[PDB]
């Protein structure tokens, strides 16, 4: 069997949107408040995360069907999935040799200890690193990686989602594409799809744990004041 | 004539509070989002200003009588005078040779053009530089400079001020101290006091113009998102 046009156009659109919103040179990191090794890494990681949110939004607006939803639904999907999309795109810089994220220079090489200095515990970081490694091992093609992100961001089962029917249809179509592609263009990817869908489940638990820890941080003004206006908006609960 | 104890203790308290909240090495500037020469200087100047607000608050809490006021009054005084206090403390780094503010390295040497890249017009910057130069020329002693800042921050004629009577008394006492000191310890300072009080009037106009221009900036989310949570709170109108 083979893939159809309006199915391959979807893959080309997503791949191009990812390239348009993911800087391989990481040349914007020098513009963030510098990293410093109470919670010394918060300023830098807050800027890193704020900047990633902007990228995720740019990516989302290019997912076919996303721009047609209501602003309320677009926001509901972004706010509830943003951290999961960030965690997925960060895998691109994850390294199985040092279990860290390397983004250009040694200054921008994040260890599990660095995130700790941003207010997080191993309760989150442990499962997170485990997730990164598991995903890194699936050796996804750029096409599957980008499809996984679009499928994640287009989940109708998120709090605040209104037009659950139209979003269910957009995500179903993205799922077919991923299934067809793995079956046709990924030699040895017999069990891949199920393992990918499994990764979305893992993300739900990480999202849940990240939200708790973030809530704790946002309730302490000496820490929340270190965050950016975009981070406070997206991770805030003032919907 | 000579100065009394509880009048000299006031001067020692203010001078010490200023030293405790004003870093002569400017070693914290490297922690701000780096300067970049639409509104390229906004990230850096927003961090500079956010950091100065924190210093002004630290200074205010050490002004005798300030910590006893109501939280509402302390906040009302801080929000309405913060920019004026920032402008006064920045004169310490102002240079009459280059009409710029020099804070350590060449990276942290601010020109009137830099502020322009933070969203401001000559409508403000012109009077501002003129103010800086006029004040720089008064060649104030550290004692008068610090007294001028405390007198400015303890002005009862600010919107939101409730206990206008107690604040009027705190500022009157600070004014006597400044008058006595100039008369007793400042050879040639016959006309100084009036020129200093004149500088507070000038600050009112700068504050007024700065507020307009800031309001314009805060209404555009692509710009307000570059600000910090503390700057948004202090310069915001959500009292």
């Amino acid at each position: 069997h083979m893939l159809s046009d309006e199915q391959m156009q979807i893959i080309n659109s997503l791949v191009e949107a990812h390239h348009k919103t993911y800087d391989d040179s990481y040349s914007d990191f020098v513009r963030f408040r510098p990293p410093v090794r109470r919670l010394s890494m918060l300023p830098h990681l807050a800027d890193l995360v704020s900047y990633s949110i902007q990228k995720v939004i740019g990516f989302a607006k290019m997912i076919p069907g996303f721009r047609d939803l209501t602003a309320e639904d677009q926001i509901a999907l972004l706010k509830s999935s943003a951290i999961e999309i960030i965690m997925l795109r960060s895998n691109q810089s994850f390294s199985l040799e040092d279990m860290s994220w390397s983004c250009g220079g040694p200054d921008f090489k994040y260890c599990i200890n660095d995130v700790t200095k941003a207010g997080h515990t191993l309760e989150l970081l442990e499962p997170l690193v485990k997730f990164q490694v598991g995903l890194k091992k699936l050796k996804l093609h750029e096409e599957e990686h980008v499809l996984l992100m679009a499928i994640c961001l287009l989940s109708p089962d998120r709090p605040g989602v209104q037009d659950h029917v139209r979003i269910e249809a957009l995500q179903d179509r993205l799922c077919d594409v991923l299934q067809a592609y793995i079956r046709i263009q990924h030699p040895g990817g017999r069990l891949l799809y199920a393992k990918m869908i499994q990764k979305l489940a893992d993300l739900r638990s990480l999202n849940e744990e990240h939200s708790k820890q973030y809530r704790s941080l946002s309730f302490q003004p000496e820490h929340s004041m270190q965050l950016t206006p975009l981070v406070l908006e997206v991770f805030g609960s003032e919907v | 004539h000579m100065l009394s104890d509880e009048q000299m203790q006031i001067i020692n308290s203010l001078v010490e509070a200023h030293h405790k909240t004003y870093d002569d090495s400017y070693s914290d500037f490297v922690r701000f989002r780096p300067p970049v020469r639409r509104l390229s200087m906004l990230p850096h100047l927003a961090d500079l200003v956010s950091y100065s607000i924190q210093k002004v608050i630290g200074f205010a809490k050490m002004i005798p009588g300030f910590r006893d006021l109501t939280a509402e009054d302390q906040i009302a005084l801080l929000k309405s005078s913060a920019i004026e206090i920032i402008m006064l403390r920045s004169n310490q780094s102002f240079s009459l040779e280059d009409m710029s503010w020099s804070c350590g390295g060449p990276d942290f040497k601010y020109c009137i053009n830099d502020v322009t890249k933070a969203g401001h017009t000559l409508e403000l910057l012109e009077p501002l530089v003129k103010f800086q130069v006029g004040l720089k020329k008064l060649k104030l002693h550290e004692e008068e400079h610090v007294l001028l800042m405390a007198i400015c921050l303890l002005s009862p004629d600010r919107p939101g001020v409730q206990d206008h009577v107690r604040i009027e008394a705190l500022q009157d006492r600070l004014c006597d101290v400044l008058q006595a000191y100039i008369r007793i310890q400042h050879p040639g300072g016959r006309l100084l006091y009036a020129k200093m009080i004149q500088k507070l009037a000038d600050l009112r106009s700068l504050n007024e113009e700065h507020s307009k221009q800031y309001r314009s900036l805060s209404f555009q989310p692509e710009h307000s998102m570059q600000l910090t949570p503390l700057v948004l709170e202090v310069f915001g109108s959500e009292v």
């Binding site: 902007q54 939004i57 607006k61 602003a71 677009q74 926001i75 972004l78 706010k79 206006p229 975009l230 908006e233 997206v234 003032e238 919907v239 | 989310p221 692509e222 307000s224 998102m225």
Partner: peptide, 10 residues
């Protein structure tokens, strides 16, 4: 309010 997100979503 989400004014930043609205602006960014164009």
């Amino acid at each position: 309010k989400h004014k930043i997100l609205h602006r960014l979503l164009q």
